[PDB]
Write a protein that binds this ligand. Structure first.
Ligand code: SAH
Lengths: 227, 6
């Protein structure tokens, strides 16, 4: 049987979180560190993310606003710099790794002056301000949370959306089940698991898209827009 | 990050 939940694969939740924190503390604060040796795919990623997001920014009743975005698991701000700052008047960042948020101030340069809050916190401990964000962007980090913490975090995110706001998840997906990476202390979940968690959080799918033009050897990557 | 299928 494939595993369907993190409670089948995580031996010790405190250790699951503490190992991950130790792992990121020893990664270079660079794009290649953010992307696990795949820094070269960054522009492919950012281009696809932009096209994806722009579907929600068209004029009409449901137009997503452009006042403020939240970058979750932001690291040094790769996504903040190239995707979000150009489109949103202000951006807030949240990440567990202080060294990355420090580096972000250099990495983001002058445009980084529009980053408002730098929150140094685990997602599992973070409660975003109600009615604050037009877009909450969650990329390449959901594997670091347990199913219970991810569902809860998504509920808190829902309460922080402005009218017409969306949450975006973009992440690695397993073909089947829930797969533990015991080196970076994360899990990779299949699309059925991720959709289940989204539904548990009282969220609905607006769109789902597979990322194209990636190296053949890596986990498939999907984007979900939610409200 | 993006990563090799184990
Ligand atoms: N529990 C947690 N809460 C918040 N951030 C976490 C976390 N576990 C890991 N992270 C952060 O998740 C990031 C993964 S690297 C991906 C960085 C960014 N999303 C991008 O795509 O460029 C690192 O910056 C790491 O510090």
């Amino acid at each position: 049987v494939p595993r369907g939940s993190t409670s089948e694969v995580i031996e010790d939740e405190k250790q699951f979180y503490s190992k991950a924190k130790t792992y990121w503390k020893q990664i270079p604060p660079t794009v290649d560190g953010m992307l696990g040796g795949y820094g070269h795919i960054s522009s492919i990623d950012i281009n696809s993310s932009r096209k994806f997001l722009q579907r929600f920014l068209r004029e009409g009743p449901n137009k997503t606003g452009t006042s403020c975005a939240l970058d979750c698991g932001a690291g040094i701000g790769r996504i903040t710099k190239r995707l979000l700052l150009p489109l949103f008047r202000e951006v807030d960042m949240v990440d567990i790794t202080e060294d990355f948020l420090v580096q972000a101030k250099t990495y983001l340069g002058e445009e980084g002056k529009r980053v408002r809050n730098y929150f140094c916190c685990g997602l599992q401990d973070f409660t975003p301000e109600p009615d604050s964000y037009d877009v909450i962007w969650i990329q390449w980090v959901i594997g670091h949370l347990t199913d219970q913490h991810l569902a809860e975090f998504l509920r808190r995110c829902k309460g922080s959306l402005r009218p017409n706001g969306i949450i975006v998840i973009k992440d690695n997906m397993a073909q089947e089940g829930v797969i533990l990476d015991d080196v970076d202390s994360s899990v990779c979940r299949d699309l059925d698991v991720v959709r289940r968690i989204i539904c548990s959080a009282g969220l609905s799918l607006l769109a789902e898209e597979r990322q194209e033009n990636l190296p053949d050897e890596i986990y498939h990557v999907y984007s979900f827009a939610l409200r | 990050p993006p990563k090799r299928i184990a």
